[PDB]
Structure formats: structure tokens, C-alpha cells
Amino acid sequence: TTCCPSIVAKSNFNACRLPGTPEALCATYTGCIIIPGATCPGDYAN
Numbered sequence: 001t002t003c004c005p006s007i008v009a010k011s012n013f014n015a016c017r018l019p020g021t022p023e024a025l026c027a028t029y030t031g032c033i034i035i036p037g038a039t040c041p042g043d044y045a046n
Helices: 007-017 023-030
Strands: none
Touching: 007 023
């Protein structure tokens, strides 16, 4: 599950992922974090 600082960061993450780019790379590009649980904490953008 990808949990992002903001909707802008998550939009950038999703754009990175669209052509297949590995999740960890898109995470570092955006500031989004990856957690195994189904639910992001607090008010992070899923």
C-alpha cells in the first residue's frame, strides 16, 4: 500500500507507476512510503 504526503505526491507516484516503473523508485521520487498493511495511517493519501 502506498501512503503519500499529499495528493500531488500521489498523483506523481501514480504517473511514475503507469508505464511499470518499480514501486520503490516511484516512492523515492515522490516521498510516498510503502507499507504492507491495507490502510494508511492518519491522513496520508493512499
